[PDB]
Design a protein around this ligand. Structure first.
Ligand SMILES: C[As](C)(=O)[O-]
Ligand SMILES: C[As](C)(=O)[O-]
Ligand SMILES: [Zn+2]
Ligand SMILES: [Zn+2]
Ligand SMILES: [Zn+2]
Ligand SMILES: [Zn+2]
Lengths: 330, 329
């Protein structure tokens, strides 16, 4: 129906407002924030940095973010709840698995993984009672056997609960096509799926064909760019060397092709990032001081100046996330 | 003179009969708290561990060293709970095993050193419980990241006096590469136990390590898949040699004059999610004695082979005390 799970409890979807559909409070690893908080200075410092950042995003018009950190990205839902409340910004938590499953996950069957995802959606995450409102999955270009289990478990959990699925792709590898085939083999509707990191490629043929099938297209890393940082290999590898404008122009491109309803936009920002090289967070913040406010402050005016009507931009940042997040079918 | 446990410091005289390589639960970081139903429930797992420790205690055991690291899903709050209920001392570990997540795998030796030091000097998580041992693991030749872990472990040991204990593939003589790295760092072999050393019959490999002053961890004695050789996963994990065959290594090293260098354990667990489903049931049917296997089966087996009480007490009480007591000499 029209209620979704947030880390402060259930809300009606009209309350979500401007929603960033792919963000992170902290990109980490299972257990890591609690075992080694000084990696982030302190847990308090991290929380305060996130509260400041979310408050700025709120001032810029953001009302909800979707934290697509899974278990193996070190999702700490107690932290998400703390910062959501202090910033007074809705946060939707995720279940699923990303690219770093530990052995206790890697060795599980599709049936076992289905029950883990269902636990996090239907019962709660850890002992917090906080329930996930979305399932996040990730694959390499060519889907591994384990990753295929994860996608099937995600599809089964979605069909059982109605909560949507969102993905990490290598867009230069057209990763969404293999994901989509697996999802549809499970009877999952494309309208319950966002193919993410789709702004990492300029292949409009790939993008429009997925959109034509009813998939949501995640243009979710707009401010990611290492232009000017070419001498930094780790930052280049992570952020790419296409401009944020180049990424943003894909939003216009899909609108022009008639697929405004299939677009979801985000920053894929974080306030801490331990699952990459040390100090990457400082590099990212030096490139994009706006953080999660980058979409409303820079991208929206960029799009309006290009001639895209207000109603279309509002449709993308409010209506599309609302349809996507509302639990649908069963 | 003082050893840190999950209930606080104890004097070496308090440690008594100590099992130096054990696990309450072999898991993954965050896993027990994210999916306790994998083990039935957290309560079920705790209760199994308390009964298990009480059985070990009734067989004479007074302390175990839980060598579960961060990435083996060590939950020291669980360790504290079961230690208290069973009245058995538990020494917690820092270090890294074979499943480091990205947030660990991407770290420098300097960063890893600070993490190991934090868990020894400050406490684990926000519990104030301090590690009393550093556990490391290698495969084969030693990977570049594993080398960083071993060096970080040596540096944390050298700063604190806390000993290092290892996981090897003994069939690949893996202790040799570990020893080389430790010695390059200035670490005394008397601070190092080369573990899973009972997984080979190469006595020349073992005695040579002992002769250099390493402790030899004969720590997986009941691990055997005899009869289960058509169970591939059990066979790869548990091996095809009998427990008597493993146990005879203890006698062999004593007869070579190295009783002071021997540490014995079960390497048991009460839950095990970082392997195939139902492995705990397979393991429990193979060794229904659990952590009581060493005192109930191995000690009488050695006594019947003519090893005197004084020697067995030196191995199970004196050697662990000397090893665990923090020392920079
Ligand atoms: C945590 As990411 C760089 O896959 O959005
Ligand atoms: C957790 As193990 C089988 O390396 O002792
Ligand atoms: Zn991603
Ligand atoms: Zn992301
Ligand atoms: Zn081991
Ligand atoms: Zn072990």
């Amino acid at each position: 129906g029209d209620r979704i799970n947030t880390v402060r409890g259930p809300i009606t979807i009209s309350e979500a407002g401007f929603t960033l559909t792919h963000e992170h409070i902290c990109g980490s690893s299972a257990g890591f924030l609690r075992a080694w908080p000084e990696f982030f200075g302190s847990r308090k410092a991290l929380a305060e940095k996130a509260v400041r950042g979310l408050r700025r995003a709120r001032a810029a018009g953001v009302r909800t973010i979707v934290d697509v950190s899974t278990f193996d990205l070190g999702r700490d839902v107690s932290l998400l709840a703390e910062v959501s409340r202090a910033a007074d910004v809705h946060i939707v938590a995720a279940t699923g698995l990303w690219l770093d499953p530990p052995l206790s996950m890697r060795l599980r069957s599709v049936e076992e993984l289905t029950q883990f995802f269902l636990r996090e959606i239907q019962y709660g995450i850890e002992d917090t009672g906080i329930r996930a409102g979305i399932i996040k999955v990730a694959t390499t270009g060519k889907v591994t056997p384990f990753q295929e289990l994860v996608l099937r478990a995600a599809a089964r959990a979605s069909l059982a609960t109605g909560v949507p699925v969102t993905t990490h792709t290598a867009a230069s590898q057209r990763g969404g096509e293999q994901q989509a085939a697996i999802f549809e083999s499970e009877g999952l509707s494309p309208s319950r799926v966002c193919i993410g990191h789709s702004d990492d490629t300029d292949d409009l043929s790939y993008l429009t064909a997925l959109a034509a099938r009813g998939y949501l297209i995640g243009l979710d890393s707009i401010p990611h760019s290492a232009i000017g940082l070419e001498d930094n290999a780790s930052a280049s590898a992570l952020l790419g060397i296409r401009s944020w404008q180049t990424r943003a122009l894909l939003i216009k491109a899909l609108i022009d092709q008639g697929y405004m309803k299939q677009i979801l936009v985000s920053n894929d920002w974080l306030f801490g990032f331990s699952s990459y090289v040390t100090n990457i967070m400082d590099v990212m913040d030096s490139v994009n001081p706006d953080g999660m406010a980058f979409i409303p402050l820079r991208v929206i005016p960029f799009l309006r100046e290009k001639g895209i009507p207000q109603e279309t931009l509002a449709g993308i940042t409010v209506t599309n996330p609302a349809r996507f997040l509302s639990p649908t079918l069963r």
